[PDB]
Structures are given as structure tokens and as C-alpha cells.
Amino acid sequence: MKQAQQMQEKMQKMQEEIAQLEVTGESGAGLVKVTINGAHNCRRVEIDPSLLEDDKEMLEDLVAAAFNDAARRIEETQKEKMASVSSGMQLPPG
Amino acid sequence: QEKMQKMQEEIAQLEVTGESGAGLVKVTINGAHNCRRVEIDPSLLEDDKEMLEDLVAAAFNDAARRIEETQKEK
8 A cells, every 4th residue: 555555546547548538530521520538528519511401310310420430439549548558568567 | 346247238238318408409328338319409400500519519428427327326
């Protein structure tokens, strides 16, 4: 606990680094973009004005596809942050 | 001390719908963060584009906060 607390509090700092990464998913090549952080909080949705005229249900599915594109991207980003932390030996050794 | 092999997986299959604007937008997701459906009220398409974008983000985040609340207690 001068040797087994600072695993748990190094763990917390790493959760915070992750939580702050972001990505931007898109559907229709950018007709909808969703920006989300490493804790799955949605920071920004952007919707092209051409989608508000017609097909509500088109707009709806493109929104959902954007979110799912952002979820896949954020999982990629997290996996790269785990690669980087581990290869970097960035934890207390043990 | 551990039974989370099968409890983060209960979360993962589970579905909540977040809402904003008092029901005007609803966003259904799972604990695996897949978005199943988005429902947007026709009134929002007229002129409030910035409003509509903020309400979408708020409904997703309501969903995400119910999923978090669900595994807070478990």
C-alpha cells in the first residue's frame, strides 16, 4: 500500500486518459457526423440540411449508422491506447 | 469477489432507450454501445437544425447514463 495502492490509482488515471480521446463517425460520407469520447459520451451531432426536407426515416437510419460508425472508431482508438500503454510499459512493473 | 464474466455481458445484451426534449427524440442502444434505433419527432425538421442536433446528442447520452446507472447498482 506503498506498493499495492498505486496500481489502482494508476488505473484510474488511465481511465481518465481514455475517457478523453475522441473520434468522429460518419454516415453517407459525412451527411451525418457524430463526435463521441472514450467514455461513450456524445459531444456533437452534425446533420446535413438536405436531410431535414424529406424522409424522416432515412434521417433516422443515417443517424444510427453514424453513431455505430463512431462506436467502431472509438473501440479502435481504445485498442491503440491499450497497445501503447502496454508496449510502453507505462504501468508499475508487476 | 468476481462474477463479472457474466454481468458486463448482461449489460451488453440489455437495451435502454434515452430520450430528450420530453420524448421528442429517442435513441435506443445496447450496453455493447450499438445503436438500434433513433426516433425523431416530425416537428423538429421544420427549422430548428441546431436544436435537433443538440437533442440527438442529449438522447444518446441519456441512454448512455441509464446503461451506467444499471451497472452502478449491479
